[PDB]
Design a protein around this ligand. Structure first.
Ligand code: CLA
Ligand code: CLA
Ligand code: CLA
Ligand code: CLA
Ligand code: CLA
Ligand code: CLA
Ligand code: CLA
Ligand code: CLA
Ligand SMILES: CCCCCCCCCCCCCCCC(=O)OC[C@H](COP(=O)(O)OC[C@@H](O)CO)OC(=O)CCCCCCCCCCCCCCC
Ligand SMILES: CC1=C(C/C=C(\C)CCC[C@H](C)CCC[C@H](C)CCCC(C)C)C(=O)c2ccccc2C1=O
Ligand SMILES: CCCCCCCCCCCCCCCCCC=O
Ligand code: SF4
Ligand code: SF4
Lengths: 143, 80, 92, 86, 155, 41, 740
């Protein structure tokens, strides 16, 4: 956002019984993600790993293994309870990385504060043929 | 990972950014369409390849393309 | 409190739920008997060489298959054999 | 956790279930006593006890079902008294 | 008042403490077993594991086999078990020379789980040490099964 | 009445008018005229 | 509180909606732009949940659809009665049940087709039927064809009444949701009224009209000289002559001297030696007991008079220490969702059909049914297939409920939440059990194959060599045989002759002979257990992972019936719950085919045959124990040794079975085209054909697209199941009709 909110521990995690689908040996050997949000009341949400958990009042923090799980929980909280979550990626060493939203507004807005990347000023269909890009290691779209 | 490309025939409807389930695409400002915004893809390393953006693309042909390539732990969707 | 950044060696699942540490299991000098016994094969190349030389046992073992009297080398039986196979011809 | 509720008084059912098994004298003389006399000839490592021995296997299985179901109900009813489970 | 709950107060992990694992009889028994012992030397661990396996890999091989009906040959049919434990020792050494590669050392994560050190069995030389102990133990266990099966008395 | 006659123009007009007509025509031809292997020339 | 909430005149009765074909869904109202609209119109015609979210409207729609189904079944039943009344030889078969074959269908002589009208005997020629309708019409007294004619007319009248009831309850008097949610009242009336009063009325029919079959028809009396059923009902002397207890006249029933009705309420453990079926007096006493049991069972729940129970209270009063809450919102789940009830009902319905299949061949209940091997094998096989299809449907609707009507708010720590919480442990254990059963149940067959091929027959799993005997089933068989001497003193003999020692035979042919068990029975039983575990694995995985998996965390929002989730994560094809049902259907077919094969070969080699003075000779050479241990034994002594009748069936009366045999093979081979190929290939090929039509200006107005991804899978599985089932059908029917 206006400043990357640094992820901090000692946050009240939601009450949940022990699940079975989550945090394997990769969540420790390689990397894992963590989502934090703010809840205005006490409700019961559905975790993307099994049953349902409740929403503890105040801050909330959950940890997952894949970025898709955190993104799924993010869109569920944004379309069913009207919240504003944010998740990070914790590496093996302990390097926290801000992930969503990077610009901090939302990824579907403009904000005029980001430069476009991976764009082709030509239209699809104007790409050259496979024969032209031979032994060049590159591809028509990459060119 | 996979290589995503956005062509100039984009209309800026912001549907691919809404259909992406891994926050790969974004909307940057542009000066070549009526909406004055074009999609981009900064988090290409997080592309998984489900091709939901191509289904969300309304123009013919698709302005966004997902060319599959090498696979990593993130692009293979592995949780272990 | 459910997640910590620095002491991540205890919050993600890095545990040993079945292991105890002790320097005693076997009785005195019994271990010494097995130490000297297992010293020769202690290395990787040593054990691979042991089983590689012990692999020739199958070759030698097949030669001494006489005691086994396996159907293979005992005979094929001259009296009864399928040299009358088919009805169109005596042999073919 | 690590303290699964067991009372030494739970043996009261497995020990008070047998009297109740000796009651019926209408057929043979008793389900349990018949189980004891029929198993009595199959205790010194005898080959007998084949499928033809209707008095050993059947009485064993029936008597065991009665004993296990009453031990189960006894533990539920005894330990259920403190957990507000009448 | 349930006998099932999460481990260490954090439920987002896959391992959910169930009665089977929670059980003290199961907890202490698994810890007593020769593989989970970390302080004991690897050679020693390999010999105990190899003794039990070399002994159990004989019986089902000597009763059911190509020469299970020939009286004296049936006792001699237990040699295969020796060939089996030999193949087992070879593949165990093959796994040790490739699991803990020289490039990959500790592989990260010190592991807390109550004040105690990383097992040296996971080292490069530790797996070879274990492979040795398993080889001597399996060969010795097969030989004991064959010696004991002829002087077992009224077997 | 207009709705019933327009309902009768969807699937019955093609699956029960033509099918019944063609099947009945071929069957009555093979019934009055027995089994035809040539032009009877 | 339980009242009759009706809402009169909610939907008009016109043909305006019949004009527009797509009107139930808001997506098909735009019309057909592409050919996929037609297939969407047919696939969404009954998905009432997709029509609206109104539970009252959905409940009204399913209530009228039930009446439509009842009218269809009644029309089919009336057609069978009318065919048996006019185009059959029931009167000729009634005087000679051991020599004339049943037939209730005559074909018209158009192109050839006279050959099908086979000489079934009795001065009649037609298609030989294997439905058992003649044996059923024998069991409840029916002598002439006038009664069958009257039954057909009465059933047609009832069918018209059911169709009128459906129209009435959906357009003129539709009920309300508060009326549909009275599960206690519905259970009370279904247990007390439907089942209980049905058993009581059928017991009364067996007590009065089933009298010729139990006393005059079996005594050799000509069916014409037998008195009409109303004479036995009115005249008490004519019924007192047959059974003397009828002379008492309702006095022992009300004076509690039931011991006087011991002549027509017998408890005989066995079969009738003159007919082969169960005793009619035993079946009557059976129905009388069942009626009393259900009548006392229908008074459990409380409706409007205080006394009774509350299903919500019974469920909420069951909380244990290993299941957390348990049964918390099960009443809310089972009273607001139709898919949950449909899954439970379909599971129990399919399992009940399988029970019916086993008990019918075990204890034959109709006269001259055990000596009709064609109808015996046919009825067993048919009931088995219907049961398997229903269980796969139960596995489908459970996933449909879990995807649509599963709210994670009313289920916090109940059984459903705990089950969805440890789904990984459940699926992994079922996976291991499946693999273990496969190795230990199929490796024995492959091991016997290799041992027989290598010239070592003494090293195979057989009765002569190293054996495996099913001692538990042998002990249960022995227990059931010696059971009427100690644990059933009032029973005359064992409830069945499957484990007995007395072979019964009617007309020279064996009716019910004792069944022995050996090593091959152990091997085939483990084969059955293995295939059942794989089918339950595929279905249970689909149900437990239909909501959200660890690979695809947003599988709930994707729907129930979807193609895949793109080529990401290496590929996610058939990850939907619907795809698991498609895979399951395949495994159910593979399981039930082995079940019916085991039945047919075991019966033909160990029970059926013909008895003579010098022993009993079976249908086959009694090679079930010496040829079932190897895979080559099945392909050689079952499919190749049998089916020779189906093969040589040309020019005979059963010539349609060879045509059905070859035709079924083509349909199965046609399924592979839809099952292996994709969709892009067909779409590009269709594009080339569209160019050819555009060159001649014959381009269809509705642009011609290829089938959907799920449509191709659906078409392929439908063609596959049709081809395989029809192949086994033609083979079974031709073999047992030409041999038995
Ligand atoms: C002639 C009297 C009549 C008339 C004019 C209508 C008219 C109407 N009905 Mg209605 N209905 C009737 C009788 C009638 N119904 C009866 C007897 C029943 C009880 C079954 C119902 C139950 C009923 C329900 C539940 C619903 C309607 C609905 C409707 C409306 C639109 C549906 C439609 O297009 O029909 C469909 C036209 C057809 C021609 C359907 C024929 C299907 C037949 C019965 C199947 C035959 C089986 C087949 C032969 C098997 C072979 C297949 C093979 C593969 C095995 C419409 C205004 C719907 C509605 O109100 O919209 C919300 C609604 O949901 N009706
Ligand atoms: C489940 C399938 C199956 C089974 C049960 C068997 C069984 C057998 N086969 Mg065999 N076989 C099979 C498939 C199978 N086969 C197939 C598919 C082929 C074709 C490729 C063959 C080809 C074949 C040949 C050529 C021969 C056999 C032979 C044999 C016999 C001795 C073989 C042997 O080495 O002993 C068994 C050795 C073992 C190591 C068994 C281990 C037992 C495990 C450990 C279970 C016991 C522990 C268990 C996990 C309990 C848990 C304890 C708990 C505390 C954890 C034996 C009875 C030989 C024979 O002559 O037959 C008499 C022989 O020559 N088979
Ligand atoms: C026995 C199985 C079977 C059958 C019948 C077919 C049949 C066909 N394939 Mg095919 N195929 C099969 C297996 C089969 N395939 C398998 C296993 C594969 C590998 C996956 C393929 C892969 C394949 C490819 C890639 C292609 C074909 C193509 C074709 C069509 C070729 C055109 C032709 O020959 O004229 C017609 C031949 C027929 C046999 C017509 C069958 C219809 C008859 C007349 C019955 C009509 C039904 C009758 C009127 C009753 C209807 C009522 C009923 C609905 C109740 C044809 C319909 C090619 C194609 O599309 O052609 C343009 C093509 O591209 N096939
Ligand atoms: C639509 C194609 C078709 C055609 C061309 C015919 C033609 C014919 N039918 Mg026919 N019919 C058909 C369909 C058809 N049928 C169908 C689908 C059925 C089943 C409902 C019937 C059932 C039927 C019966 C039961 C009978 C005929 C009969 C007849 C013949 C005399 C009728 C007549 O004089 O009319 C005009 C002639 C124009 C040339 C005639 C040649 C009658 C017959 O057999 O003749 C003795 C006869 O009784 N048909
Ligand atoms: C003792 C009274 C009684 C009886 C005999 C029945 C009988 C039946 N009910 Mg019903 N039910 C009752 C009371 C009763 N119900 C009450 C009080 C309620 C309110 C809680 C319900 C609510 C209810 C629902 C929601 C449904 C049924 C259904 C059914 C049918 C199940 C079809 C079947 O499985 O095979 C058995 C088939 C037969 C025995 C054929 C007999 C056909 C005749 C015509 C049935 C006549 C019985 C009828 C209830 C008489 C009173 C109506 C009168 C005004 C004419 C069956 C005929 C299902 C259905 O609608 O199917 C159409 C269903 O969906 N019932
Ligand atoms: C559940 C079915 C059922 C039915 C329908 C019957 C029916 C009958 N049984 Mg019975 N029975 C049954 C089961 C059944 N039984 C069972 C399960 C057993 C035990 C196994 C018995 C054992 C048994 C014995 C031992 C005897 C009978 C007998 C009878 C007959 C006379 C009984 C009688 O007079 O009672 C009373 C009848 C009534 C009270 C009449 C009903 C009232 C009428 C219908 C009211 C209509 C009036 C209306 C308002 C106005 C008229 C309309 C007009 C103006 C047009 C009768 C036809 C006797 C017999 O054999 O008959 C020869 C007899 O001896 N039964
Ligand atoms: C009590 C029985 C029952 C009931 C009421 C339902 C009801 C329903 N099912 Mg279902 N199901 C059942 C049993 C049942 N099912 C069984 C036994 C199976 C296992 C096979 C399934 C498997 C199943 C699946 C996989 C699906 C459903 C779905 C549905 C829903 C919509 C279906 C539809 O749109 O109809 C449409 C009507 C048709 C498609 C006509 C059927 C045509 C068949 C396939 C041809 C069969 C050929 C015939 C036997 C022989 C013809 C020969 C030829 C020569 C003419 C609906 C609520 C669908 C859903 O989305 O749920 C929400 C879904 O996809 N069911
Ligand atoms: C003949 C073809 C075939 C075969 C052999 C299999 C085999 C298998 N299927 Mg399968 N399947 C098939 C066709 C086949 N399928 C088709 C056509 C479909 C489409 C409907 C499916 C759909 C399907 C599904 C959806 C699933 C399976 C599953 C399985 C596995 C279950 C394992 C088990 O419990 O039994 C035992 C396994 C075997 C007996 C394999 C044979 C091994 C023999 C004994 C060889 C023994 C080893 C040998 C001696 C060593 C060789 C030495 C060599 C290396 C030198 C199994 C390995 C299930 C699964 O994944 O497992 C949980 C699963 O869910 N199948
Ligand atoms: C013959 C059938 C198959 C044989 C082997 C079956 C074992 C495979 C599955 C076991 C999974 C264990 C997880 C239990 C999950 C579990 O613990 O649930 C909890 C349950 C106790 O729960 P509560 O008392 O808290 O439940 C009370 C309330 O929930 C009431 O609704 O414990 C049991 O199930 C005891 C039965 C153990 C297993 C008995 C096998 C049941 C099969 C049918 C009966 C067989 C009896 C012997 C006949 C031969
Ligand atoms: C062949 C095929 C197609 C093409 C399917 C088509 C074109 C459907 C054909 C439907 C026909 C037109 C229905 C009518 C059939 C005959 C015309 C009936 C004969 C009647 C005569 C008497 C006139 C797919 O779209 C497909 C999709 C996904 C997986 C596999 C496949 C697949 O295998
Ligand atoms: C479908 C509409 C008609 C529904 C009513 C059918 C009435 C049929 C009544 C029985 C008719 C039998 C006629 C038999 C004539 C030949 C008699 C010889 O067996
Ligand atoms: S393929 Fe999937 S993950 Fe990749 S950009 Fe498109 S929607 Fe996002
Ligand atoms: S969906 Fe297509 S047209 Fe719309 S913003 Fe994305 S790339 Fe541009």
């Amino acid at each position: 956002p206006w400043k990357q909110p640094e992820l901090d521990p000692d946050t009240p995690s939601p009450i949940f019984g022990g699940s079975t689908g989550g945090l394997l040996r990769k969540a420790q050997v390689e990397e894992f993600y963590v989502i934090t949000w703010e809840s205005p009341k006490e409700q019961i949400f559905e975790m993307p790993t099994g049953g349902a958990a409740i929403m503890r009042k105040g801050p909330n923090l959950l940890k997952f293994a894949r970025k898709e799980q955190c993104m799924a929980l993010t869109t569920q909280l944004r379309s069913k309870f009207r919240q504003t979550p944010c998740f990070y990626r914790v590496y093996a060493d302990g390097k926290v990385q801000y992930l969503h939203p990077k610009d901090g507004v939302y990824p579907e807005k403009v904000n005029a504060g980001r430069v476009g990347v991976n764009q082709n000023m030509r239209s699809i269909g104007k790409n050259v043929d496979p024969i032209k890009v031979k032994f060049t290691g590159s591809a028509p779209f990459e060119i | 990972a996979h290589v995503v490309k956005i062509y100039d025939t984009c209309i800026g409807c912001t549907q691919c950014v809404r259909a992406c389930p891994l926050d790969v695409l974004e909307m940057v400002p542009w000066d070549g369409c009526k909406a004055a915004q074009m999609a981009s893809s900064p988090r290409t390393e997080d592309c998984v390849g489900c091709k939901r953006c191509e289904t969300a693309c309304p123009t013919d042909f698709l302005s966004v393309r997902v060319y599959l390539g090498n696979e990593s732990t993130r692009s293979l969707g592995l949780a272990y | 409190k459910y997640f910590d950044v620095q002491d991540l060696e205890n919050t993600t699942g890095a545990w040993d739920l079945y292991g105890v540490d002790e320097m005693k299991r076997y009785p005195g000098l019994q271990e010494e008997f097995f130490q000297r016994a297992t010293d020769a094969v202690s290395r990787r190349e040593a054990l691979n060489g042991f089983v590689a030389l012990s692999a020739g046992v199958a070759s030698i073992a097949l030669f001494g298959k006489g005691a086994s009297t396996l159907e293979l080398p005992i005979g094929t039986k001259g009296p009864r054999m399928e040299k009358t196979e088919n009805g169109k011809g005596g042999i073919l | 956790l690590r303290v699964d509720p067991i009372v030494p008084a739970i043996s009261f059912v497995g020990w008070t279930l047998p009297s109740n098994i000796g009651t019926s004298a209408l057929n043979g003389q008793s389900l349990f006593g018949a189980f004891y006399e029929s198993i009595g000839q199959n205790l010194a490592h005898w080959p007998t006890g084949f499928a033809l021995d209707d008095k050993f296997w059947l009485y064993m299985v029936t008597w065991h079902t009665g004993l296990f179901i009453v031990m189960l109900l006894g533990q539920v009813g005894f330990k259920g008294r403190t957990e507000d489970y009448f | 008042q349930q006998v099932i709950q999460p481990l260490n107060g954090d439920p987002f992990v896959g391992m959910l403490e169930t009665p089977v694992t929670s059980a003290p009889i199961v907890a202490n028994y698994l810890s007593n077993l020769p593989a989970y012992r970390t302080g004991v030397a690897p050679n020693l661990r390999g010999v105990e594991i190899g003794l039990a396996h070399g002994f159990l890999l004989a019986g089902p091989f000597i009763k059911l086999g190509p020469l299970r009906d020939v009286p004296g040959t049936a006792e001699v049919v237990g040699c295969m078990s020796a060939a089996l434990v030999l193949i087992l020792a070879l593949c165990l050494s093959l796994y040790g020379n490739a699991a803990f590669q020289n490039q990959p050392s500790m592989g990260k994560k010190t592991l807390s789980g109550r004040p105690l050190p990383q097992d040296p069995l996971m080292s490069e030389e530790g797996w070879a040490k274990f492979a040795a102990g398993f080889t001597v133990g399996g060969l010795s266990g097969v030989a004991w099964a064959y010696i004991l099966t002829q002087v077992c008395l009224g077997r | 009445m207009k709705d019933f006659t327009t309902y009768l123009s969807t699937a019955p007009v093609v699956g029960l008018g033509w099918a019944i007509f063609t099947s009945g025509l071929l069957i009555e031809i093979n019934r009055f005229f027995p089994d035809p292997l040539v032009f009877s020339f | 509180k339980v009242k009759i909430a009706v809402d009169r005149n909610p939907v008009e009765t016109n043909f305006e909606k019949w004009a527009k074909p797509g009107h139930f869904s808001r997506a098909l109202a735009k019309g057909p732009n592409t050919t996929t609209w037609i297939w969407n119109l047919h696939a969404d015609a009954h998905d009432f949940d997709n029509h609206t979210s109104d539970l009252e409207e959905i409940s009204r729609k399913v209530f009228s659809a039930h009446f439509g189904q009842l009218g269809i079944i009644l029309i089919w039943l009336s057609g069978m009665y009318f065919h048996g009344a006019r185009f059959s030889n029931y009167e000729g078969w009634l005087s000679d049940p051991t020599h004339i074959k049943p037939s209730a269908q005559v074909v018209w002589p158009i192109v050839g087709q006279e050959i099908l009208n086979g000489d079934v005997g009795g001065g009649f020629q037609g298609i030989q039927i294997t439905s058992g309708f003649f044996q059923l019409w024998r069991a409840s007294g029916i002598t002439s064809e006038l009664q069958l004619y009257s039954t057909a007319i009465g059933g047609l009248v009832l069918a018209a009444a059911c169709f009128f009831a459906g129209w009435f309850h959906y357009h003129k008097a539709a009920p309300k949701l508060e009326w549909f949610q009275n599960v206690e009242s519905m259970l009370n009336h279904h247990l007390a009224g439907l089942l209980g009063l049905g058993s009581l009325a059928w017991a009364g029919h067996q007590i009065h009209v089933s009298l010729p079959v139990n006393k005059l028809l079996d005594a050799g009396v000509d069916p014409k000289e037998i008195p009409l059923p109303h004479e036995f009902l009115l005249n008490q002397s004519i019924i007192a002559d047959l059974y003397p207890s009828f002379s008492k006249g309702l006095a022992p029933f009300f004076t509690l001297n039931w011991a006087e009705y011991s002549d027509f309420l017998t408890f005989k453990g066995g079969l009738n030696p003159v007919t082969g079926g169960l005793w009619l007096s035993d079946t009557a006493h059976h129905h009388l007991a069942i009626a009393v049991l259900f009548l006392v069972a229908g008074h459990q729940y409380r409706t409007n008079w205080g006394i009774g129970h509350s299903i919500k209270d019974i469920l909420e009063s069951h909380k244990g220490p290993f299941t957390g809450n348990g049964h918390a919102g099960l009443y809310e789940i089972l009273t607001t969702s139709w898919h949950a009830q449909l899954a439970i009902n379909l599971a129990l319905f399919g399992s009940l059909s399988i029970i019916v299949a086993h008990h019918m061949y075990a204890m034959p209940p109709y006269p001259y049914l055990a000596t009709d091997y064609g109808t015996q094998l046919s009825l067993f096989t048919h009931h088995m297939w219907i049961g398997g299809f229903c269980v796969v449907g139960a596995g489908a609707h459970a996933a449909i409920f879990m995807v649509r009507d599963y709210d994670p708010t009313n289920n916090y720590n109940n059984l459903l939440d705990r089950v969805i919480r440890h789904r990984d442990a459940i699926i992994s254990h079922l996976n291991w059990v499946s693999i273990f059963l496969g190795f230990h149940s199929f490796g024995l067959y492959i091991h016997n194959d290799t041992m027989s091929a290598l010239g070592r027959p003494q090293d195979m799993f057989s009765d002569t060599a190293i054996q495996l005997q099913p001692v538990f089933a042998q002990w249960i068989q022995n227990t059931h045989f010696t059971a009427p001497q100690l644990t059933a003193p009032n029973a005359l003999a064992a409830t069945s002759l499957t484990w007995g020692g007395d072979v019964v035979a009617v007309g020279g042919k064996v009716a019910m002979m004792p069944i022995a068990l050996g090593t091959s029975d152990f091997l085939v039983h483990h084969i059955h257990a293995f295939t059942i575990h794989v089918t339950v694995l595929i279905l249970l995985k689909g149900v437990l992972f239909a909501r959200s998996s660890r690979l695809i965390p947003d599988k709930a929002n994707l729907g129930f019936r979807f193609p895949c989730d793109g080529p990401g994560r290496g590929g996610t094809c058939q990850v939907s719950a619907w795809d698991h049902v498609f895979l399951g259907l395949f495994w159910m077919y593979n399981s039930l085919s082995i079940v019916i094969f085991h039945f047919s070969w075991k019966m033909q080699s160990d029970v059926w045959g013909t008895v003579t003075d010098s022993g009993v000779s079976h249908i086959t050479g009694g090679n079930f124990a010496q040829s079932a241990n190897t895979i080559n034994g099945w392909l050689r002594d079952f499919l190749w040794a049998q089916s020779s009748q189906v093969i040589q069936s040309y020019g005979s009366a059963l010539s349609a079975y060879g045509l059905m045999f070859l035709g079924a093979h083509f349909v199965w081979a046609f399924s592979l085209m839809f099952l292996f190929s994709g969709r892009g290939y067909w779409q590009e090929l269709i594009e080339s054909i569209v160019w050819a039509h555009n060159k001649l200006r014959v381009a269809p107005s509705i642009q011609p697209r290829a089938l959907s991804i799920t449509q191709g899978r659906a078409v392929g599985v439908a063609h596959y199941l049709l081809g395989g089932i029809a192949t086994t059908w033609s083979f079974f029917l031709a073999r047992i009709i030409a041999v038995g």
